[PDB]
Amino acid sequence: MKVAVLGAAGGIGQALALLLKTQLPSGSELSLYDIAPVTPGVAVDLSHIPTAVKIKGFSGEDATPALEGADVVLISAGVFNVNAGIVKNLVQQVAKTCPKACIGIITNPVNTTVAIAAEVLKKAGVYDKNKLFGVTTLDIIRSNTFVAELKGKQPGEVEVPVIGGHSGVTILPLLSQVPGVSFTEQEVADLTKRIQNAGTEVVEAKAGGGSATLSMGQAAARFGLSLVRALQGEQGVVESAYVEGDGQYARFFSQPLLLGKNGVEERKSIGTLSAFEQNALEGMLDTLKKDIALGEEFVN
Ligand SMILES: [Ag+]
Predict the structure, then answer these.
(1) How far is the CA of 263 from the centre of ligand 1 (A)?
(2) Largest CB tally within 10 Å, which of 41, 129, 218, 244?
(3) How far is CA 74 from CA 33, 79, 126, 283, in A?
(4) Is there a binding annotation on residue 12?
(5) CATH architecture of the region 137-291
(6) How far apart are the first and last CA of the chain?
(7) Catalytic residue among 21, 131, 166, 222
């Protein structure tokens, strides 16, 4: 399997690339692309780690050599304005060079950029709804951390379902579904708010000087590695991502996905919702739909 990271020179890209270099299956390939001219040496830096993952890096305006042969494309470039055009340009190159790959959109605003990517793929005539993913995994590992801390559980043992979108009120952690624990009314309210604003914690703690890069690299790595396990034939691999699903709530929606050799193998039910969660779901959907329309309109 060959994984291409676009935007590999930024904070998220370098963290992601480091984890993939050390954790992808032996015999994989990792290609790094970023407009920053340092990118070939980010790959050379990583190439000195003795794992059986061949890694090369590319800069300039042409992402094609990084995308040659790619099976998975993870897109972390950017910093709406500028990121809309970057995602559009880069998905255009993906559609021309490796249209059969699975595409993981990390570039935010994920709610909207996944829609941009969809429309660019549709105009290219190669759009496969089962191969376009909004990487929401950072919401899940955050929820796992906060619930484990509150409830005195081991962090690696707690898994919190999170559905919906990837920003603010559209992020819906399903605390009612966490096995073995229950939450008071205040704890639901506090936990949900913290999860929906967790990125702001880092910004304030960085004194406004940066954003979440290292935890985001870890979350993208978790998704990217599960996806590759599935594309190599492992079964029972379930991960949540923002995908063009059936559309019962919105055109794109994050829900549990059984992954397979062709991307999404099955969109799984979001399951039973508490009255709090059903109400938060209904309250955010207009915002989520307008995030989606913004991305559709950028391209069309
Ligand atoms: Ag694929």
Answers:
(1) 5
(2) 244
(3) 10, 15, 18, 31
(4) yes
(5) Alpha-Beta Complex (3.90)
(6) 33
(7) 166
| Token duo for residue 145 | 């951390």
Q: Which residues surround ligand 1, an ion (CB under 5 A)?
A: 102, 263
The CATH code of the domain at 2-134 is 3.40.50.720
- Known binder of ligand: residue 125? no
166 assigned to active site: yes
Centroid of ligand 1 to alpha carbon of 224 (angstroms): 11
Q: What sign results for the dihedral spanned by CA atoms 55, 56, 60, 65?
A: negative
Any idea where the domains of the chain sit in the sequence?
2-134, 137-291
